[PDB]
């Protein structure tokens, strides 16, 4: 049986901090077959299950999409496991792939911090592997304007204090550019 990539061939891919995760088990799949539908620009690489994350992502930020980077993408948006084989692929949607639709712009989280109820301690919220930023609950799916400041007062059950985030934007390109994060679990 063949793994179905159809979920990602239709609709608007989310922004990096809302990466869409597809999990594949018990099916055959050829990654090159999936990539033959795109115009691949870059890839970096370092069975039981295949995890495929995808999102809108501008090629001009390719240096930020790296395990090495102390930049905001790896700190606050998206981080892959360091213990499994992984790949990162940047590709462009070709004109004859008409069913992937464009968002208004590219967005990413530039800062995400808790401010504790002592009114003194700021705690940067570094994203963990295979997890979303805690700030996805306050950052909209598309950031309204570069530099937007989002904030929420937390409840006692949530730990008190505040959650704050800052959003950044990059102008949309003529063809949508995308990122793919792949992690394999070998048995």
């Amino acid at each position, epitope marked *: 049986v063949e793994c179905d990539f159809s979920p990602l061939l239709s609709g608007t891919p989310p922004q990096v901090y809302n990466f869409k995760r597809l999990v594949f088990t018990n099916c055959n799949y050829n990654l090159t077959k999936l990539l033959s539908l795109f115009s691949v620009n870059d890839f970096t690489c370092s069975y039981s299950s295949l995890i495929l994350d995808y999102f809108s992502y501008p090629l001009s930020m390719k240096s930020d999409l790296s395990v090495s980077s102390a930049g905001p993408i790896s700190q606050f948006n998206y981080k892959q496991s360091f213990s499994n084989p992984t790949c990162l692929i940047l590709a462009t949607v070709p004109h004859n792939l008409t069913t992937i639709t464009k968002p208004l712009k590219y967005s990413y989280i530039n800062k995400c911090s808790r401010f504790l109820s002592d009114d003194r301690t*700021e705690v940067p919220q570094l994203v963990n592997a295979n997890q979303y930023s805690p700030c996805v609950s306050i950052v909209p799916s598309t950031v309204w304007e570069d530099g937007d400041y989002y904030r929420k007062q937390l409840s006692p059950l949530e730990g008190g204090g505040w959650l704050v985030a800052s959003g950044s934007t990059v102008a949309m390109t003529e063809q949508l550019q995308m990122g793919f994060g792949i992690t394999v679990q070998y048995g």
Partner: antibody
Amino acid sequence: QVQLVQSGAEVKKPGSSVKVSCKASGGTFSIYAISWVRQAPGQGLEWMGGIIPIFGTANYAQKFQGRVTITADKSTSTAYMELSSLRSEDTAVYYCAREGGHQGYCSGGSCYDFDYWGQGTLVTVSS
Amino acid sequence: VVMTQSPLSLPVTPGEPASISCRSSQSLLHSNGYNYLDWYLQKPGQSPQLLIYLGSNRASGVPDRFSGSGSGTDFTLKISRVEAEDVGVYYCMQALQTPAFGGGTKLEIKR
């Protein structure tokens, strides 16, 4: 609600620098945007710059870029405005002002619905 | 962004309505659906105070007599029945990116 108490009046020689303070009470100080606005005698209001303390990110009007430094100290809930190379045209009442705090988010990084105002600080630049 | 406020001064007979206009050199309507225009009043010898924010939102404790309207470049502050307490200088303020005040309108009592 919120109270903004500014430091007292000052007299400064031309060419020197002045630093005015604004101590805030009520609410989480580091979370809300604070601005500085001045008013020369008989003239209108003029926005100088602002800061959100938790970010430490201050912005300024182009007219005051390079002469004004706005800072904030969460240990005392105080914002500061320092203006250097004082000229007689800088004689003015300086006000601190804080957002009302109920906008759902701050577009572009900062909120400017100035619901709270300090009492003003008169700065007289003269020989 | 240039804000043109008119008139410069406004004598108003007590009890009668008043209107102040503010025209911006570029649209103040943000993609989030709000117009970034505030109205402030500064009474004699006092600090400024907020009347209207984000085009038409009345600030807390501001009487129903004040209302703001408009979208894009033309905005109006209206006072339904002017009162002695209302004397002072009214300022509009655009907040689309970097705040800037209009020149002010001095409201005084007509006699």
